[PDB]
Amino acid sequence: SPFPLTSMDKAFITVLEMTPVLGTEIINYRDGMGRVLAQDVYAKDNLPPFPASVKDGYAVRAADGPGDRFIIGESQAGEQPTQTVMPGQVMRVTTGAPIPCGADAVVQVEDTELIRESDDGTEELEVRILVQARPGQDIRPIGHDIKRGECVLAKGTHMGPSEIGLLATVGVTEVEVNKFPVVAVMSTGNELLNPEDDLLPGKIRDSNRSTLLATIQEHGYPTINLGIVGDNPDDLLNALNEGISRADVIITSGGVSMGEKDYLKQVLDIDLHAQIHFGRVFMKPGLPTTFATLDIDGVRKIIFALPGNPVSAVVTCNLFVVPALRKMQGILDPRPTIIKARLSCDVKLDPRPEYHRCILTWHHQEPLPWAQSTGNSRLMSMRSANGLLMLPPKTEQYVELHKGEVVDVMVIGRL
Amino acid sequence: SPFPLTSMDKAFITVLEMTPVLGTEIINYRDGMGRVLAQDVYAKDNLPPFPASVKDGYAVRAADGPGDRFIIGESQAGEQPTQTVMPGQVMRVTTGAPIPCGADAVVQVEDTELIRESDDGTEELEVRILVQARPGQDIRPIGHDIKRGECVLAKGTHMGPSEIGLLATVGVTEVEVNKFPVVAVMSTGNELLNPEDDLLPGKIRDSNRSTLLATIQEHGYPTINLGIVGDNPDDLLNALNEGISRADVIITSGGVSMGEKDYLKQVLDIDLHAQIHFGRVFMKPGLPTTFATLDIDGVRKIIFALPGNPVSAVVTCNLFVVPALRKMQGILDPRPTIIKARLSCDVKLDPRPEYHRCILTWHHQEPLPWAQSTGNSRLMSMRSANGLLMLPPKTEQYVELHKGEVVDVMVIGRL
Ligand SMILES: Nc1ncnc2c1ncn2[C@@H]1O[C@H](COP(=O)(O)OP(=O)(O)O)[C@@H](O)[C@H]1O
Ligand SMILES: Nc1ncnc2c1ncn2[C@@H]1O[C@H](COP(=O)(O)OP(=O)(O)O)[C@@H](O)[C@H]1O
Ligand SMILES: [Mn+2]
Ligand SMILES: [Mn+2]
Ligand SMILES: [Mn+2]
Ligand SMILES: [Mn+2]
């Protein structure tokens, strides 16, 4: 064309605006990790469903006050008691056991002294209550934690272990959630060999497919490996159609600059009839990053055609692809987390906004983490990149950023 | 006993010191995510393996300087060229294509003007070189990025997508790594019903098993569901033996306090013959947290018997279990990441160090995140807990922490 230089902000907003939210499905709660609820979840039981002891000790009548009491029996966990505590009496309780009728408080064993037990030692007979219990003391009334009819999880909730536990608690074992996107990845280039291949003259190994697939899998999404496609329109079109058939998202790398054998934009526009929203981004690296949508049968397929350069591919995957996938799986605010960090080294600014993988480290008591760019100590190289340095365009004023200065870092890995 | 109150530091150090590092195994590189290399990895080829163009343009003799040149042919990606560029000649090159013999520089197409092409438009015949190229300009010599024999990944490296990509690049598709721990989880209590069950009198649903399993699975480790075990020594012993047989790690919850039917410590010591290293921790919550090891046939099994209270169970799982699992899978420094954050609310300190799940949020330009404790707005409850507030013991001086004050937060989720 060549396509107009799209600002990073416009590119990003465009990606998020044009990316659809996937439909819903019912899953088992155990499979809920990373999923977004598409329904409100309601409790059908009280928690606790019975008045429950907070302590190991004795269920008592507060009105009896302190004194020596006969132990008429035991309320054990999982058993509904049958006896009624009368004045002068108490019942042994364990944590979480039901409070028997007639008792209105629990006194913990520490606030008691044992008077009499069986010759065996099996059974407590008589106990001294040393304190004045307040009514309701150390008891969880019915519904104290969760009431029947209460909404315990709202739609839009991004679920982790505790939410799964809550679902378990209220017995809601099937829930409606957004689907996860199925993401197909292909590499392009006549020069590319499989990782498993010995080198041949003029060839190199395909690395982008592995890196991109791993990046997507790290976020929990199912993937499809479309292999290596040669630099020619027919094969590219066929591969793209396959991806379209098998997946919600297609990621390609390579062939998006203006070289003689860079065919992706051509194929996307002319042959696939997709709508290219941008074909160049004013960013370093990632200049030729291309974003397209294809509407078939009321379904929007999304296509990221990333640059062939490996660094560019992984960086742009992290900047554009992951947020899109996050929106598709129903996350309401799909933006990545951005944090403030101190630069470990000086850095020259480019007229384009710059992006670089880094490692975030927190030092013993210093409030801000340090961001160390990868590529350039022993222990540091044994850590995977967990940040993406986001450096601003140079200006007539500011030309270079110095060690210790605060910059924005996008989180791309567990810290 | 009751077991001595173990300080948090001592408990943690004890866990890490007593936890073994698992043996190694060979995996396919695609399965490398989250794995730790147990070997150094060496490149057997140069990258690039041929002198490679950095630009789309023309391979030239720098000594010819600027001027009009005949295009004798094309070096295309994946093809070893055969022709030799002579004085007055150039060859078209695309990015990553081999540099033909006789050429010592590349001039990008922007620094040229096309003079003559074929009547078809298929083929460039004559081009004007507008610049004086420096020798070696825009060429990657053989081995520039990676040299044959170079160690590209060191043992001890915790791998993410980029490492997998590097493995792909150097064609090392099988690697030695540490095994992942297999983790078995059981719940205990006569009062517990499965999540799938309707409630019966005196009963509640088992939530800990789901929460703990989900927590472990979130970190990538395979798990085994040992179900619900009643409060009695025989069944507990059988379940424990099953876990021992099927797994490297056993997590139980419940039955570790001093209640009448709390049998875990007894069973662990007397019946299983495990070595309990601590049975109480001076912490809130998690007082009765119990840690044991069992050495069989030169293999150390590790057992975490966590408190029954759900909050206690998830908190202590995050404080003690995950770091242990991180050590077992070969991570050299298994400590979790701790960050500084500002409290969103005032909080009373306890004589014990306090721990609470929270949500970390970064505000637009403020350097430090805010930590909001869970449980007590609309949008915030739709986010999973990603932090664990670590609050210090109260002192005669400091009794309460105030809004805005900086505290330690342990990262437990993607931010
Ligand atoms: N798996 C579980 N799910 C939900 N609640 C549980 C679970 N296990 C125990 N509890 C509850 O936690 C509380 C403490 O149980 P207990 O077994 O006495 O813990 P401890 O380990 O302190 O002895 C009780 O109210 C009990 O019902
Ligand atoms: N999958 C891949 N793995 C490793 N290197 C690649 C891959 N795809 C492309 N490359 C390399 O990246 C560079 C740019 O390739 P190209 O397809 O021209 O990218 P662009 O998208 O900028 O046109 C070339 O040197 C090429 O060999
Ligand atoms: Mn290419
Ligand atoms: Mn190209
Ligand atoms: Mn119990
Ligand atoms: Mn107990």
Mutate one of B118, B153, B211 to test the A interface: name it (highest A CB count within 10 A). Answer: B211
User: How many CB atoms sit inside 10 A of residue B130's CB?
Assistant: 12
| Three-state helix/strand/coil letters over chain B | CCCCEECHHHHHHHHHHHCCCCCEEEEEHHHCCCCEECCCEECCCCECCCCEECCCEEEECHHHCCEEEEEEEEECCCCCCCCECCCCEEEEECCCCECCECCCEEEEHHHEEEEEECCCCCCEEEEEECCCCCCCCCEECCCCCECCCCEEECCCCECCHHHHHHHHHHCCCEEEEECCCCEEEEEECCCEECCCCCCCCCCEECCHHHHHHHHHHHCCCCEEEEEEECCCHHHHHHHHHHHHHHCCEEEEECCCCCCCCCCHHHHHHHHCCCEEEECEECCECCCCCEEEEEEECCEEEEEEEECCCHHHHHHHHHHHHHHHHHHHCCCCCCCCCEEEEEECCCEECCCCCEEEEEEEECCCCCCCCEEEECCCCCCHHHCCCCEEEEECCCCCCCCEECCCCEEEEEECCCC
Residue B229 CA to chain centroid, in angstroms? 33
- Are the beta carbons of A242 and A259 closer than 8 angstroms? no
Please enumerate in sequence order all residues whose Cβ is within 8 A of that of A331, keeping only pairs 6 or more positions apart, or say none: A36, A158
- Are the beta carbons of A139 and A121 closer than 8 angstroms? no
What's the rounded Cα separation, in Å, for the pair A374 and A380? 9
> Could you check whether the bond before residue A2 is cis, i.e. omega within 30 degrees of 0?
yes
**In Å, what is the CA distance from A241 to each residue of A227, A247, B265?**
14, 10, 61
- Are the beta carbons of A278 and A292 closer than 8 angstroms? no
Nearest ligand to residue A203 Cα: 2
Instruction: Quote the minimal CA–CA distance from A9 to chain B in Å.
Output: 16
- Are the beta carbons of B126 and B71 closer than 8 angstroms? yes
Put simply, whether B114 touches A (Cβ < 8 Å) is: no
What's the rounded Cα separation, in Å, for the pair A162 and A152? 12
B168 → closest Cβ in A50, A154, A207 = A207
> Could you check whether the bond before residue B49 is cis, i.e. omega within 30 degrees of 0?
no
A205 → closest Cβ in B169, B382, B411 = B169
- Cα A102 to ligand 5 centre (Å): 24
Nearest ligand to residue B204 Cα: 1
What's the rounded Cα separation, in Å, for the pair A277 and A268? 11
Half-sphere exposure of A385 (CA within 13 A, CB side): 26
- Are the beta carbons of A302 and A19 closer than 8 angstroms? yes
Residues of chain B found within 8 Å of residue A170, distances taken between Cβ atoms: 205
Put simply, whether A162 touches B (Cβ < 8 Å) is: yes
User: How many CB atoms sit inside 10 A of residue B265's CB?
Assistant: 23
Give bridge partners of residue B303 from the DSSP assignment.
B250, B292
Residues of chain B found within 8 Å of residue A96, distances taken between Cβ atoms: 189, 191, 204, 308
Q: Is the dihedral of CA B253, B259, B262, B265 positive or negative?
A: positive
User: How many CB atoms sit inside 10 A of residue A374's CB?
Assistant: 16
- Cα B55 to ligand 4 centre (Å): 8
Q: Which tokens in the block code for residue B174?
A: 């099988």
Residues of chain A found within 8 Å of residue B251, distances taken between Cβ atoms: none
Q: Chain A window 346-405: which residues touch B at a Cβ cutoff of 8 Å?
A: 357, 362, 366-369, 374, 378, 381-385
What's the rounded Cα separation, in Å, for the pair A140 and A148? 15
- Are the beta carbons of B186 and B227 closer than 8 angstroms? yes
- Cα A167 to ligand 2 centre (Å): 47
What's the rounded Cα separation, in Å, for the pair B297 and A144? 49
- From A55, A79, A92, A95, give the residue whose CB has the most ligand 1 atoms within 8 Å, as the site to mutate: A95
Residues of chain B found within 8 Å of residue A201, distances taken between Cβ atoms: 50, 80
Chain discontinuities in chain B, listed by preceding residue (C to N exceeding 2.5 Å): 376
What's the rounded Cα separation, in Å, for the pair B102 and B89? 10
Cβ pair B203:A78 closer than 8 A: yes
Residues of chain B found within 8 Å of residue A171, distances taken between Cβ atoms: 195-199, 205
What's the rounded Cα separation, in Å, for the pair A135 and A132? 9
CA-wise closest residue to B52 among B144, B124, B133: B144
What's the rounded Cα separation, in Å, for the pair B158 and A384? 6
- Cα B188 to ligand 5 centre (Å): 6
Please enumerate in sequence order all residues whose Cβ is within 8 A of that of A386, keeping only pairs 6 or more positions apart, or say none: A358, A359, A360, A411, A412, A413, A414, A415
- Are the beta carbons of A328 and A366 closer than 8 angstroms? no
Q: What is the rounded radius of gyration, in angstroms, for the C-alpha atoms of chain B?
A: 31
Q: Is A253 in the pocket of ligand 2 (CB under 6 A)?
A: yes
Q: Which tokens in the block code for residue A303?
A: 């296509």
Q: What one-letter code names the amino acid at B226? A: L
Q: Which tokens in the block code for residue B398?
A: 């400091």
**In Å, what is the CA distance from A144 to each residue of A50, A59, A140, A150?**
10, 18, 6, 12
- Are the beta carbons of B357 and B381 closer than 8 angstroms? no
What's the rounded Cα separation, in Å, for the pair A164 and A172? 10
Q: Which tokens in the block code for residue B364?
A: 């637009």
**A56: phi then psi, degrees, rounded to nearest 5:** -80, 120
What's the rounded Cα separation, in Å, for the pair B212 and B186? 9
Give bridge partners of residue A361 from the DSSP assignment.
A370
Nearest ligand to residue A96 Cα: 1
What's the rounded Cα separation, in Å, for the pair A331 and A36? 6
- Are the beta carbons of B162 and B156 closer than 8 angstroms? no
Phi-psi region of A19 (alpha: psi -120 to 50; beta: other; left: phi over 0): beta
B162 → closest Cβ in A48, A80, A385 = A385
**Parallel, antiparallel, or unpaired: how do β-strands A338-343 and A370-373 relate?**
parallel
- Are the beta carbons of B291 and B304 closer than 8 angstroms? yes
Q: Which tokens in the block code for residue B78?
A: 């994946």
**Parallel, antiparallel, or unpaired: how do β-strands A290-296 and A387-391 relate?**
unpaired
- Cα B337 to ligand 1 centre (Å): 29
Rounded to 10 degrees, the C-alpha dihedral A367/A373/A374/A379 comes to -40
- Are the beta carbons of B65 and B132 closer than 8 angstroms? yes
CA nearest A357 in B: which residue?
B162
**In Å, what is the CA distance from A302 to each residue of A273, A283, A371, B142, B412?**
13, 21, 33, 38, 32
CB-count exposure of residue A134 (10 Å: 0-12, 13-18, 19+): exposed
Q: Which atom of ligand 1 is nearest to the CA of B209?
A: 1
CB-count exposure of residue A277 (10 Å: 0-12, 13-18, 19+): middle
| Three-state helix/strand/coil letters over chain A | CCCCEECHHHHHHHHHHHCCCCCEEEEEHHHCCCCEECCCEECCCCECCCCEECCCEEEECHHHCCEEEEEEEEECCCCCCCCECCCCEEEEECCCCECCECCCEEEEHHHEEEEEECCCCCCEEEEEECCCCCCCCCEECCCCCECCCCEEECCCCECCHHHHHHHHHHCCCEEEEECCCCEEEEEECCCEECCCCCCCCCCEECCHHHHHHHHHHHCCCCEEEEEEECCCHHHHHHHHHHHHHHCCEEEEECCCCCCCCCCHHHHHHHHCCCEEEECEECCECCCCCEEEEEEECCEEEEEEEECCCHHHHHHHHHHHHHHHHHHHCCCCCCCCCEEEEEECCCEECCCCCEEEEEEEECCCCCCCCEEEECCCCCCHHHCCCCEEEEECCCCCCCCEECCCCEEEEEECCCC
**Parallel, antiparallel, or unpaired: how do β-strands A406-411 and B139-140 relate?**
unpaired
Give bridge partners of residue A304 from the DSSP assignment.
A251, A291
Put simply, whether B157 touches A (Cβ < 8 Å) is: yes
- Cα B260 to ligand 6 centre (Å): 8
- Are the beta carbons of A209 and A187 closer than 8 angstroms? yes
Q: Which tokens in the block code for residue B10?
A: 């001592």
**In Å, what is the CA distance from A385 to each residue of A58, A98, A400, B296, B327?**
56, 52, 23, 39, 20
Cβ pair B198:A98 closer than 8 A: no
- Are the beta carbons of A124 and A68 closer than 8 angstroms? no
CA-wise closest residue to B302 among B292, B311, B310: B292
CA nearest A203 in B: which residue?
B78
Helices A208-218 and B161-170 sit at what angle, rounded to 10 degrees? 160
A367 → closest Cβ in B47, B189, B368 = B368
CA-wise closest residue to A389 among A397, A376, A378, A259: A376
Q: Is the dihedral of CA A136, A142, A145, A151 positive or negative?
A: negative
Half-sphere exposure of A211 (CA within 13 A, CB side): 28
What's the rounded Cα separation, in Å, for the pair A124 and A228? 76
Put simply, whether A272 touches B (Cβ < 8 Å) is: no
CA-wise closest residue to A206 among A217, A196, A221: A196
Cβ pair A218:B161 closer than 8 A: yes
- Are the beta carbons of B286 and B339 closer than 8 angstroms? no
CA-wise closest residue to B94 among A204, A259, A201: A259
Domains of chain A: 1-23+180-337 (3.40.980.10), 24-47+146-179 (3.90.105.10), 48-145 (2.170.190.11), 338-415 (2.40.340.10)
Q: Which tokens in the block code for residue B190?
A: 């006569």
**B123: phi then psi, degrees, rounded to nearest 5:** -140, 125
Q: Is B373 in the pocket of ligand 2 (CB under 6 A)?
A: no
Give bridge partners of residue A75 from the DSSP assignment.
A93
* Residue entry with tokens 């003029």: A202
Q: What one-letter code names the amino acid at B157? A: T
- From B263, B266, B309, give the residue whose CB has the most ligand 1 atoms within 8 Å, as the site to mutate: B309
Q: Which tokens in the block code for residue A59?
A: 């269920």
Cβ pair B78:A45 closer than 8 A: no
Put simply, whether A326 touches B (Cβ < 8 Å) is: no
- Cα A243 to ligand 4 centre (Å): 22
CA-wise closest residue to A101 among A71, A130, A129, A80: A80
- Cα B159 to ligand 3 centre (Å): 27
A56 → closest Cβ in B154, B258, B332 = B258
- Cα A260 to ligand 4 centre (Å): 8
Q: For ligand 4, a single-atom ion, which residues have Cβ within 5 Å?
A: A 257, 259, 262; B 95
Put simply, whether A308 touches B (Cβ < 8 Å) is: yes
What's the rounded Cα separation, in Å, for the pair A141 and A382? 53
* Residue entry with tokens 């409850």: B381
Q: What one-letter code names the amino acid at A312? A: S
**A352: phi then psi, degrees, rounded to nearest 5:** -95, 150
Q: Which tokens in the block code for residue B214?
A: 């989900």
CA-wise closest residue to B139 among B56, B60, B53: B53
What's the rounded Cα separation, in Å, for the pair B18 and A125? 43
CA nearest B52 in A: which residue?
A202
> b/e per residue, B145-163, with b = 16+ CB within 10 A?
bbeeeeebbebbbbbbbbb
Q: Which tokens in the block code for residue A8?
A: 């990073």
Half-sphere exposure of A6 (CA within 13 A, CB side): 22
User: How many CB atoms sit inside 10 A of residue A293's CB?
Assistant: 16
CA nearest B310 in A: which residue?
A165
Put simply, whether B264 touches A (Cβ < 8 Å) is: no
Residues of chain A found within 8 Å of residue B187, distances taken between Cβ atoms: none
Q: Which tokens in the block code for residue A248?
A: 């919600």
Phi-psi region of B123 (alpha: psi -120 to 50; beta: other; left: phi over 0): beta
Chain discontinuities in chain A, listed by preceding residue (C to N exceeding 2.5 Å): 376
In angstroms, this model's resolution equals: 2.0
What's the rounded Cα separation, in Å, for the pair B260 and A53? 14
What's the rounded Cα separation, in Å, for the pair A278 and A275? 9
Q: What count of residues does chain A have?
A: 415
Q: What count of residues does chain B have?
A: 415
Put simply, whether B271 touches A (Cβ < 8 Å) is: no
What's the rounded Cα separation, in Å, for the pair A193 and A189? 9
Q: Measuring from atom 12 of ligand 1, which residue has the nearest CA?
A: B309
**A322: phi then psi, degrees, rounded to nearest 5:** -60, -50
